[PDB]
Design a protein around this ligand. Structure first.
Ligand SMILES: O=C(NS(=O)(=O)c1ccc(NCCSc2ccccc2)c([N+](=O)[O-])c1)c1ccc(-c2ccc3sc(CCc4ccccc4)nc3c2)cc1
Length: 181
């Protein structure tokens, strides 16, 4: 008997990773062929879920916790001889005190920095690794958690764009009340 999980989480590591990379100037990728059509009106077009949410939180994280993050990225020096263990360790402590969206996003970034550091050392080859190491920890040290707090749907409904605006809707309203009161 055996069993596994989904892949969504993994998609986050890739999508985000790329973002953290592009933000630094890097990128790298490839193309291919499949099969599809279209006939309406092409344009940027954007979503409004984990993708957008995750990113934002990431940028704001290093902003509010510029030090809390920096000091972290300096706690682990990824290398070819580095063992996935040395990784799951550092991330463990930062996650020792229970689990909360905050630490979650604050964590994701940790990895992003690792990649930025790898490329800086002309070792982008690592990116692929750290990327897999995350999807492994997120599915063995978070999955069970994220599924106990309403998955991501909740994270995007709390500390997310559509959510941010939603919050204001109320406030701007409440204030109007006391005023008319
Ligand atoms: O912010 C946090 N929590 S929150 O109140 O739930 C929150 C606060 C703000 C936001 N968003 C607004 C932007 S700020 C932000 C901050 C964090 C995440 C996302 C956003 C969000 N959120 O979006 O989910 C959540 C938060 C922020 C930082 C840390 C944090 C920082 C450094 C370290 S170093 C360490 C172990 C050391 C150690 C290292 C190695 C080896 C051994 C020991 N553990 C750490 C934990 C822990 C929690």
């Amino acid at each position: 008997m055996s069993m596994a999980m989904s892949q969504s989480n993994r998609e986050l590591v890739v999508d985000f990773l790329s973002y953290k990379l592009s933000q630094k100037g890097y990128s790298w990728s490839q193309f291919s062929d499949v099969e599809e059509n279209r006939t309406e009106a092409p344009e940027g077009t954007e979503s409004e879920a984990v993708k957008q949410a995750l990113r934002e939180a990431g940028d704001e994280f290093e902003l509010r916790y510029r030090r809390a993050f920096s000091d972290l990225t300096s706690q682990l020096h990824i290398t070819p001889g580095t063992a996935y263990q040395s990784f799951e360790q550092v991330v463990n402590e930062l996650f020792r005190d229970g689990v909360n969206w905050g630490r979650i996003v604050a964590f994701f970034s940790f990895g992003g920095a690792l990649c930025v550091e790898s490329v800086d050392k002309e070792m982008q080859v690592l990116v692929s690794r750290i990327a897999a190491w995350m999807a492994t920890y997120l599915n063995d040290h978070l999955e069970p958690w994220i599924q106990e707090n309403g998955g991501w749907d909740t994270f995007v409904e709390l500390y997310g764009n559509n959510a941010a605006a939603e919050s204001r809707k109320g406030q701007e309203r409440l204030e109007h009340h006391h005023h008319h009161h």
